[PDB]
Amino acid sequence: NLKYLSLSNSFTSLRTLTNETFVSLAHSPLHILNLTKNKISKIESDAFSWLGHLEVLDLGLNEIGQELTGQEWRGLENIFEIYLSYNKYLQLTRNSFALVPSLQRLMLRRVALKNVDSSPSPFQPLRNLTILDLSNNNIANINDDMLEGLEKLEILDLQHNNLARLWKHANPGGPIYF
RNA sequence: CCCCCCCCCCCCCCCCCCCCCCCCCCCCCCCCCCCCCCCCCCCCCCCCCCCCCCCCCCCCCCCCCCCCCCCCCCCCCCCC
Ligand SMILES: *[C@@H]1O[C@H](CO)[C@@H](O[C@@H]2O[C@H](CO)[C@@H](O)[C@H](O)[C@H]2NC(C)=O)[C@H](O)[C@H]1NC(C)=O
Numbered sequence: 001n002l003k004y005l006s007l008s009n010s011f012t013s014l015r016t017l018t019n020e021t022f023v024s025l026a027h028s029p030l031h032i033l034n035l036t037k038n039k040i041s042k043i044e045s046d047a048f049s050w051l052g053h054l055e056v057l058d059l060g061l062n063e064i065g066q067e068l069t070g071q072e073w074r075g076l077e078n079i080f081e082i083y084l085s086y087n088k089y090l091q092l093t094r095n096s097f098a099l100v101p102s103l104q105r106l107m108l109r110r111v112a113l114k115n116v117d118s119s120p121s122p123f124q125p126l127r128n129l130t131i132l133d134l135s136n137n138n139i140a141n142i143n144d145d146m147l148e149g150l151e152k153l154e155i156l157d158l159q160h161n162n163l164a165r166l167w168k169h170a171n172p173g174g175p176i177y178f
Numbered sequence: 179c180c181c182c183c184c185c186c187c188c189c190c191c192c193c194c195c196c197c198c199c200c201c202c203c204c205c206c207c208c209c210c211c212c213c214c215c216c217c218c219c220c221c222c223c224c225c226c227c228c229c230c231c232c233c234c235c236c237c238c239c240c241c242c243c244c245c246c247c248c249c250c251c252c253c254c255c256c257c258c
Pocket residue numbers: 006008034035036056057058083
């Protein structure tokens with residue numbers, strides 16, 4: 001009957017989240033999982049495949065430095081919020097969030113975001129996305145179709161980045177209308 | 179039919195340097211909040227001790243009065 005589980009700063013050595021870490025939570029109807037401040041460094045594929053009813057996943061304030069292949073979110077069929085702010089570095093790809101179309105909140109502040117300007121936008125499948133946070137990442141380049149199709153977006157945080165060149169009339173190809 | 183040598187222009191890539199722009203970290207100063215300790219001022223409280231004042235109680239002392247008992251002395255009258 002477990003619906004809420006907080007594991008914030010509960011461990012000394014939890015560096016890698018393999019596909020066997022949460023197998024003991026398979027039969028729990030877990031909705032909220034908090035994993036902040038655990039010095040987590042790597043998330044493997046199918047790490048959260050055992051949490052099918054999960055709605056909130058908080059992974060901020062860790063040392064996660066990797067490239068999000070998108071397989072880390074397999075099995076998250078009811079997820080609504082993913083918190084990833086204040087990690088080492090996150091590199092996005094075409095299918096980083098292709099397995100979680102039900103996502104509504106995505107926080108990516110202070111993660112030193114890389115490759116957010118992919119030709120197919122990493123945020124394209126997120127049709128229900130409402131809140132997106134990309135602040136304090138020193139992002140310099142954004143394509144005009146980064147947020148295409150996100151008709152439900154309501155909050156967009158882009159402060160403390162470097163987007164000045166994109167809005168200059170002398171920028172090659174003209175200003176970026178994102 | 180075939181090589182080599184010059185000229186301009188257009189490039190590509192790797193380094194160096196200089197620019198704005200931004201991020202992170204740190205330093206200096208200031209401000210705010212919280213915590214701890216300490217000082218100063220004023221109004222008080224309780225307890226103890228000392229002193230003073232009022233009132234009261236008990237005991238005692240001094241003086242006086244009353245009653246009882248005891249003793250001495252004065253008048254007067256009878257009995258044998
Ligand atoms: C996960 O747990 C952490 C730590 O308990 C929560 O972080 C706190 O969040 C509140 C509200 O945002 C802040 O006021 C506190 O300062 C935070 N504490 C720390 C140490 O950062 C976090 O909110 C939890 N996440 C979820 C989704 O519940």
